[PDB]
């Protein structure tokens, strides 16, 4: 029982890690979308 619980908790933590990386990349690309207008000026 705790072996399967440890595997489940490990997989859930690394999936949350990948999701947090994706929402970092989306914020970076939204800043880079916004920079086009400030360079358009």
């Amino acid at each position: 029982i705790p072996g399967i619980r440890a595997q489940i908790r490990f997989i859930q933590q690394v999936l949350e890690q990948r999701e947090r990386e994706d929402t970092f990349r989306l914020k970076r690309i939204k800043g880079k979308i916004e920079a086009r207008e400030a360079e358009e000026e």
């Binding site: 949350e16 947090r20 929402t23 970092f24 914020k27 939204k30």
Partner: protein, 578 residues
């Protein structure tokens, strides 16, 4: 004050230009209808207003005026028998105006400006008032509402209006530096109300039920947490510990939940009975009400409104029980707030500051001496309910880190018809070691020892529960069957309690001590009867156990006429045996 115009409308985010000089996190009215929104992100000449309602219909060029003051609460008389919502808009007068719906832009005031109160001052012109000093009384519901000077105002008083029938807008005293003082004041709901000294928990919040003050106390000025699963008897437990409480002001905070799960609060709660006068309980209760389809910012600010109202009532010198139901609902409202602000999330989806906001909620709750010079408390029994039913979300972990007691309701016991459904194997309370001298004085000098003895018996029954589950109670040895039967009589008499009964609804410390000593004396005298060699069968069928059974269905007028006779019967029926 400072009036700009809209230049951009994206979702609930209105970028309004013109407002140079506006303050941050400051309420403002956006649009020609008037839409309440808070100002974030000042940038140059503009200001980004997060609007509470839907913006569908707003054009560009409409005025945005500024309030000047943050999200505040209007503290004063006229709040008891009151059903507010998350930003303190009285729902009954909205029902009186706009029918069964809440149209956007209903402007109603938090207090009744038309109700005439009966002023009676306790100052005189020439007195020197500093903050917190009580300067008059108003009778509200058989409840002497003591009007305070707002806690950052001082000066020399004059022009005290005489004892008459006034209204809440009229100023009652005037300082010698301008500065009139009305019957109310606006306080920001996020800064804590100032006091002079937090005391320490050494006085118990007497709940009313004889498990949550004997086995798991909470120590007035303290902090508890209860989980709510379905079918546990949650609402009857909250209503019983708000009906039979030690406190004398109750503040209930339903912080955004199902419509049908609190429209049976709003119809079952104003028909309860205050069991000290005879009238209803709503005469000393303020009730903040949010369903799950209200705006997100009200549904996030409701607990801060609840704590600020409860601190206003502790500043008068009272005992307030704040029960903030479903803090997990609040936490995902805060998660939705942080999702529109473009923040990097934390452990599940939560903000990085979830536990800082939870600490700011729970740690504003303690036994205190106020600025006037008298004690008061904001004991919080706020609940929690994770969606999975497991206790390893970030919300429940942060709550268990920052509370002082935890009372695990389990739905299995209410399925087994054990009311209240407090699991004792998973509950805990840290206020036991600190509430020691109050027990030693006001109950008995040996009270923690037999409290630990009953906890020892309930430990050992569940310790040897596996042999009973594998075999059955009739093949345990002798003393182990005595252990399971005395644990059974602890469960079926002491811990279990009927909240709908006449006199079993309340159980004080003396009555709990009486039943406590009665059960423990029967145990450690029947143990000696087994040490004689008496068989187990004659111990169980025995007529004195009916007295321990109806030990709890006895009025406390007549418990010092019952306890002595039952304790004599136990010694008699265990010296009569062989």
């Amino acid at each position: 004050m400072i009036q700009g115009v809209i230049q951009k409308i994206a979702g609930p985010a209105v970028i309004a230009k013109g407002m140079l000089g506006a303050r941050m996190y400051d309420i403002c009215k956006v649009g020609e209808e008037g839409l309440v929104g808070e100002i974030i992100r000042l940038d140059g000449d503009t200001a980004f207003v997060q609007v509470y309602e839907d913006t569908s219909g707003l054009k560009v060029g409409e005025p945005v005026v500024s309030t000047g003051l943050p999200l505040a609460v209007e503290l004063g008389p006229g709040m008891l028998n009151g059903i507010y919502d998350g930003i303190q808009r009285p729902l009954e007068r909205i029902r009186e105006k706009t029918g069964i719906y809440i149209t956007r832009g209903v402007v109603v005031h938090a207090l009744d400006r038309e109700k005439k109160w009966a002023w009676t001052p306790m100052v005189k012109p020439g007195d020197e008032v500093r903050g917190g000093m009580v300067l008059g009384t108003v009778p509200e519901f058989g409840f002497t509402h003591k009007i305070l000077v707002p806690p950052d105002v001082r000066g020399r008083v004059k022009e005290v209006k005489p004892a008459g029938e006034y209204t809440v807008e009229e100023p009652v005293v005037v300082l010698e530096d301008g500065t009139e003082l009305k019957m109310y004041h606006t306080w920001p709901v996020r800064r804590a109300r100032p006091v002079q000294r937090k005391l320490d928990p050494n006085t118990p919040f007497l709940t009313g039920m004889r498990i949550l003050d004997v086995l798991f106390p909470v120590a007035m000025g303290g902090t508890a947490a209860i989980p709510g699963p379905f079918g546990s008897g949650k609402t009857v437990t909250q209503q019983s510990l708000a009906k039979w409480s030690n406190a004398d002001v109750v503040v209930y905070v339903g912080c955004g939940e199902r419509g049908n799960e609190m429209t049976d609060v709003l119809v079952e709660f104003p028909e309860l009975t205050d069991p000290k006068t005879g009238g209803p309980l709503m005469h000393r209760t303020v009730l903040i009400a949010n369903t799950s389809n209200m705006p997100v910012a009200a549904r996030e600010a409701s607990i801060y409104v609840g704590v600020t109202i409860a601190e206003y009532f502790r500043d008068q010198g009272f005992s307030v029980a704040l029960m903030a139901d479903s803090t997990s609902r609040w936490a995902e409202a805060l998660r939705e707030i942080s999702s529109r602000l473009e923040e990097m999330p934390a452990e599940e989806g939560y903000p990085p500051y979830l536990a800082a906001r939870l600490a700011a909620f729970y740690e504003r709750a303690g036994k205190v001496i106020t600025l006037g010079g008298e004690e008061g408390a904001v004991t919080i029994v706020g609940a929690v309910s994770p969606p999975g039913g497991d206790m390893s979300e970030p919300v429940t972990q942060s709550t268990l880190r920052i509370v002082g007691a935890f009372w695990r309701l389990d739905a299995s016991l209410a399925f087994r018809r054990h009311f209240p459904a407090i699991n004792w194997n998973g509950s805990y309370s840290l206020f036991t070691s600190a509430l020691d001298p109050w027990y030693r004085e006001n109950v008995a000098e040996d009270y923690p020892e037999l409290r630990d003895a009953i906890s020892e018996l309930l430990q050992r029954e569940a310790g040897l529960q596996e042999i009973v589950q594998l075999v059955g109670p009739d093949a345990l040895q002798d003393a182990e069957r005595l252990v399971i039967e005395v644990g059974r009589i602890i469960r079926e008499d002491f811990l279990q309690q009927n909240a709908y009964h006449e006199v079993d609804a309340y159980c004080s410390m003396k009555k709990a001590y009486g039943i406590m000593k009665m059960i423990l004396a029967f145990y450690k005298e029947a143990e000696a009867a087994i040490k004689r060699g008496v068989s187990i069968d004659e111990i169980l069928q025995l007529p004195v156990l009916e007295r321990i059974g109806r030990a709890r269905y006895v009025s406390e007028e007549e418990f010092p006429a019952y306890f002595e006779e039952a304790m004599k019967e136990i010694q008699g029926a265990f010296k009569a045996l062989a």
